[PDB]
Design a protein around this ligand. Sequence first.
Ligand SMILES: Cc1ccn(Cc2[nH]nc3ncccc23)c(=O)c1Oc1cc(Cl)cc(C#N)c1
Lengths: 403, 553
Amino acid sequence: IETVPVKLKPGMDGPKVKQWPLTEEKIKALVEICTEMEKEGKISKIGPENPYNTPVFAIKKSTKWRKLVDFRELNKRTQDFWEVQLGIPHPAGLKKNKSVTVLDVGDAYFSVPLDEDFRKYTAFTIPSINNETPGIRYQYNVLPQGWKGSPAIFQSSMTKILEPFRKQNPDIVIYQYMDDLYVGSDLEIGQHRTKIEELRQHLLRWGLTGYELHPDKWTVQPIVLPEKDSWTVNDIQKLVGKLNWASQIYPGIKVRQLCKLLRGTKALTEVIPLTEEAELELAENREILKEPVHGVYYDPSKDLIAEIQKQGQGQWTYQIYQEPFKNLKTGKYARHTNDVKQLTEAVQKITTESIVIWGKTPKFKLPIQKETWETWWTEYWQATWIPEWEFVNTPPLVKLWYQ
Amino acid sequence: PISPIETVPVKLKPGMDGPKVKQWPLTEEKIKALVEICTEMEKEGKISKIGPENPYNTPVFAIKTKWRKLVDFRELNKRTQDFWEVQLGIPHPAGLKKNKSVTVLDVGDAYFSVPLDEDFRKYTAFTIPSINNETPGIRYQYNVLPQGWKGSPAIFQSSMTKILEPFRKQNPDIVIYQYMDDLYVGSDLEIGQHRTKIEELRQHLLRWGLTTPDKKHQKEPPFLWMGYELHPDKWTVQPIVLPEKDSWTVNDIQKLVGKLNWASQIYPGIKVRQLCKLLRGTKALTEVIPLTEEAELELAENREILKEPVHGVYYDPSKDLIAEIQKQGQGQWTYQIYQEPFKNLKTGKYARMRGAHTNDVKQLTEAVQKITTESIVIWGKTPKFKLPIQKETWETWWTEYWQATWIPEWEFVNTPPLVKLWYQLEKEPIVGAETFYVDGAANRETKLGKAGYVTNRGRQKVVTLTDTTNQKTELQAIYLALQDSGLEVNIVTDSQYALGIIQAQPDQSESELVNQIIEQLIKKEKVYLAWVPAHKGIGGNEQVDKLVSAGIR
Ligand SMILES: Cc1ccn(Cc2[nH]nc3ncccc23)c(=O)c1Oc1cc(Cl)cc(C#N)c1
C-alpha cells in the first residue's frame, strides 16, 4: 500500500515530551501489548538517534488493558496536515439527532502503513521501575491511534467502507472524529440500535470491530434566579451581583429597580419587602436567562474553552466559550465516586458534546492541582482521545453565579 | 576490543556541515606527546590516518608523569543531531530488592570499545600540527566513540542494551542495573550458580567486544556508589561530617544544607528552614553569615539526629508500602516509608510554599502528592498513608473546598501536632451581629490610601495608609472591622481578592496583614463574609466608598 507523505509544519519540528512515571501493572500491560505489535510489525524498536518522544499510558475501556498514546504535541505540530491539507467536514445535523452512537474504529489504522520519513515523530518509551534499565523505545510503522493525521489519511478508505450503508440509509449522519465514528439518526431507539448492528457488520468485512448519546435532549443550564417569598438584604445583594454579572454576557438584563431597594447601611438579615417593578425585572431577566445568548456564534478559526466549577455533593457546572463571557454552551455534571473520578467523567462528557456540536475538543481550565491530576487522571480515563488542559483557581464568585 | 555490533546512524543538524576549525600551533613537547598517544591509539584500531581531501577539523591539545590528549568537540557537538535523553532518573537504593548475591561489572574503555557510524567518522577529523606549522600535519579521524562527543553516552547505552537483550530474554530471574559504563547484576542464587551465571554474562559480553573485571578484580560489599553505602541487608548515605566553625560563609551554609538535604533520605526529622533563610540576601561566597538563634537551634537538633548512625532496608515486592507524615513545624513536614513497622526503606521531608497563603490541610495533601509520585518512581506503586489528620477534618475540608482534592488510601494516626482547620466561616448571615461594610482605596500616583468601615448600627472609621495598594487597603479594611467588632460579625466587602484569601481558611501567610487577620478570625465566635459589586450605588457600600475616596479618588 502506497504511503501519503506527511509534511510537518515549517520552522518547529517533532515532539520531545517527557514520559510520566507509570505503575508496575501499567508498565507490564504495555510491554505485553508492545511485544505483540512488534511481532505484528505495527511498531519497531528504535535507536538513540531518534530524539523524539510522546507520552504513553495504560487505561481500561472492560477488564482488558489498552495502550493510550498522548499525541497532543504531535497533533499541534501537524495541524496544517489534518485540519487544512486533509480535513474531515463536520455535519451540523449530528447535534439535532434523537440518538448518536459512538463507535471505536481505531483498529482500522494498523492496516495502513505510515510514511517512512514521518515514523520518527511517533517515538515513545515504556519506562522501567527505579531506572533498572533504559526505557523500551518504539516508533510506529502504521497509522497510530490517537494521531489526528490517522483519520485524515484513512478518510478515502472510510468513505468506501461506508458508501453502501450511507446509500441505503440517506438519513443517517456518520461522522469520524479521531479513532471514533459518531452515528446519528432520528429512528426509534430499537431501529437505531438495529442500524448500528448493520453498520458493525459492514465494518467487520474490512476488519474493524455501543456508547449511546441523545443530543436532541441536550438543554442549557440557565443562570437560575431564586424564587422566594421573604427576601433578605444578603439575598438581594446576592441577586444584584448575580444579575450584574449576567448583564455582561446576556443582552437586555436590567437591575436598576432591584438595586434601588438597597438604600442605606442596613443589616444583612433585615427582611425588606419587594416592589411590583423589581418583581417585573427579575421575571424579564429569568425569561432572558432560559433562552440562548444573543450574538454569540461559533468561529471555526478560534480555540474552544471549557471551565468547570466544583459545586459540592457530586455536582459540577461547566461553560464552553471562545470569548471569555460570550458562551456557546453551559451545563452540569452529576455523579463511591471521588473528586478526580468525578472531574475525569465531566471532562469526558463535555469533550464528547464538543465533538458532536463543533467537531473540536475544548481546552480545559481544571480546578485541581497539576500533580494530583497528573498522577490520577489515567485511573478513571476511558476515552481514546486526550483534550488540552490548564490548571486554574476557580474565582470564588463564578461558582455561586452558576447555581 | 571494538564491538562487532551494528552501528548507530548519526547525522548532523539539518542544514549544517561538519566543523572546520583551525588547529593552533603547539609546543614541540606537546606535538611529541600527541604523536606517541595517536600512534598507540591507531595500532589499537581507535583512530585511523586520513587523506588531505577530508576538509573537516576539530582542535587537539595535550595536557600533562603522563600526557593526556584533549580534543575540543564544541563545534562538532553544536552540529551533531540531538539524541534521545539517556536515562531520566537514577536508581534509588530503597527501590533495590535484597538479592542473595550481587556483583558489580564495570566495562573497560567503554566508548573506545564501541564503533562510530562510518558515514560520520569524517566529521571527527583532527590534526597533529607539524613543528612551527611549516609541513602538513598528521590527520586522524575516530573509528570509535570519542570522549567529549555529544552522541557517545547515548550510543554506548543503546549498544549495551542491544547486547544485553538476548541474555535478558533467557535469564529473567537475574537483575541487571545499567548505569553509565557499569552493570549491577543481582540474583537469588547460591554462590557458584551466580559466580557461573556472571562468567556466562562476562563471556557473552566478550563476544561483543566488551571487557569486564574477573572475580579477583570484581568489587566486594559494601559498595560505595553515588554517595550511598550498599550493604548486604541495609543501605545508608556515606559519612556526613558537619563542619564546626567560628564563622560561616555563604559557601559553608550552602554545603551544610546540601549535606543535610542528602542525609534527609534516611535520617528522619532533618530540618533546613532556618539554615535556608540565612542564604536569602545576595551575599558573596566568602561573605560570613552570623547564625540566628533559630539557625543555631536547627543545627543543634540536626547534629543530634546525625550523632548515631541510621540505615535503611531494601524492598520486598510481596509487601505494601506504608508512608507516614508528621508536621515538624512551620511549613515543614517529615515522612518515612516502610513495609514492616519502623524498619524504613527511606525517609524525606516536604517544606514548600505553594502560593502566598495556605493552610496545613493543603500542605498535607501537597506532601501526599509528592510522596505518591516518588513511590511510583522507586517501586511502581502508591503507598498506604498514615496521616496526622482526623477523617472528619478531611471530609469537612474536601466537601467545602472549591478545588478537586484527593488523598488515596489513608488512616488517621494520633501523632501530634494534629492537622486541623483553625476557624470556619458562616454559611448564612448572623442575626443580632453588627453588619460592617468595609472598603479600601489607594491613589496610584501618591501611593497613599484610606481603609475603613460604616456599620448598620451607625458606626464608622477611616485610617490613612502611606505605601499602599488597593489590595493592601481592602485587607486593612477587613482587619479594621475584625478589630472593632464583637465576637459575631457580618462583613460586606467589594474585594473578591480578599474574599478569596479568607474563604480558603489560611492559617499561614507571607503577608503580615493576612496573619493579623487570621489571629482575629481564630479569636471570633462567628464571622460571615459577603461580597457586593463595587461602584454600583449599593447600600452601605456606597457610604464607605465615599468615606475612603475622600482625597484618594
Ligand atoms: C543489582 C543489585 C541488587 C540489589 N542490591 C542491594 C543488595 N542486595 N544484595 C546485596 N548484597 C551486597 C551488597 C548489596 C546488595 C545491590 O546493591 C545491587 O547492585 C547495585 C545496585 C546499584 Cl544501584 C549500585 C551498585 C553499586 N556499586 C550495586
